[PDB]
Design a protein around this ligand. Sequence first.
Ligand SMILES: [Zn+2]
Ligand SMILES: [Zn+2]
Lengths: 273, 272
Amino acid sequence: NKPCIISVAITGSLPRKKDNPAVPITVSEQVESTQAAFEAGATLVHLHVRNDDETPTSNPDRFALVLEGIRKHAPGMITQVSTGGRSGAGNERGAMLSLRPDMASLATGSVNFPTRVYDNPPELVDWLAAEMKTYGIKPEVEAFDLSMIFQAAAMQAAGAIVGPLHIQFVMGIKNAMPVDREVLEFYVQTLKRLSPDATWTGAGIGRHQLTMARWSLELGGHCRTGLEDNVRLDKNTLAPSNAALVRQVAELCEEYGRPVATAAQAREIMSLG
Amino acid sequence: NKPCIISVAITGSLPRKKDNPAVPITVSEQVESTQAAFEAGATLVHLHVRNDDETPTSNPDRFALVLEGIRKHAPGMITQVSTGGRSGAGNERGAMLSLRPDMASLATGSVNFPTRVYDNPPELVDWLAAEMKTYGIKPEVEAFDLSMIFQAAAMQAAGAIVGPLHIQFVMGIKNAMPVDREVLEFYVQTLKRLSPDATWTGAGIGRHQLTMARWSLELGGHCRTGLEDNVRLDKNTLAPSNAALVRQVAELCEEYGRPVATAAQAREIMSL
Ligand SMILES: [Zn+2]
Ligand SMILES: [Zn+2]
């Protein structure tokens, strides 16, 4: 009965045109892919930007052009910029925050990724959180491991994160946290114990994208999909668009009796302006 | 009345003589501190080595001298070398594995530490484990976070780690996993689900050293103490030796009705 927010991670930093031509790279491609996903039921856009040669970038000018197009073509949709980056990258990872999006991703710890370490030094975590506060941005805590939930709660208690927490439990990444029902249940129980008014989203990478969406719907959480996490619609078929992946989650919403949240409902659930 | 193994982390990479003069730095100091801890009830020694100026090092020649002294002065004691190191350090973190100690520490993931990231690249984790498998070394998985238990179980299933797993649940480090009873209980439940024949040790830093020892004794695990994790006997007093910290844990073992394991019993429990 409770509405479900559908987040759409459109691009990411790894997916290329060779993996799936549906992956939006240019400003026009990202705006059109977001609008189609918004019309399919998505109310939150998780945004990574790319250079013309498909290489990842934190370029604030590229972010500004895409955010402007999203506000015009998908009105009311929650904008969420990514603060992800390579190992060794510092303040550059939060150079787009002054554009004042609705939200921004915040990894509160470090974790192993498939080929490298996803480095998030404590000094960088503190700086990114302080910048989001300065520009009135609501953080989305990216919890790639258990300790990151404790770090998020300790930061909220100290006043480093303002208002109710929104945390994303990420599962299915090689060398990080695998997709596990008992761990997700413990994640929710731990979040409830540390931060009772917090909201959460379950996120699955690859073939476990729909599995994490089903579990999130059952456990009273919210959903995330998109080409950033998975380029396949099923084992044999590539996803023709981000909107096609949003439709899969929207279909699961009707199956579990939870209505797809509107833009106004999504902002209310996560206590946004 | 299951026996309890007492591990002693004698030096570490951070504690200095200015923090506590009981911290063993030289080869002679580390051998005599280990022998005293062994006579106090410790059957496993977690070993870090230092340069003469107290700076941390992975020097295999320094490790060889200390391991030789431990084998002579503490016969039967399980030897465990540390493979810890700074960010950017590669295979040199496992340059002492050829010395064939009984055991070696193995962080199976990366985690945030108080001032930096404790980097453990996947390629380094694989290389360290393969070196331990080559030299017949039983790894001690250092679980600073939940995913490291899953990584350890996946490595054992693939054959990267041989025999029953031994995992150490580390709590109390700033920016890593805080001291929490419910998380430790979930750690044990998860380990039992993934690796039913695995053994485990609970480790606490600073004030949480004795807290984790009490919880490990209650939950059917093993204990770890030593100057590497805590330099104080209590809030007002510094620990006069590693043996004094081992005595605290040995007293807790009798309090919880679990006997202090002998060197032979510790080797049987570890499947060594
Ligand atoms: Zn992202
Ligand atoms: Zn150590």
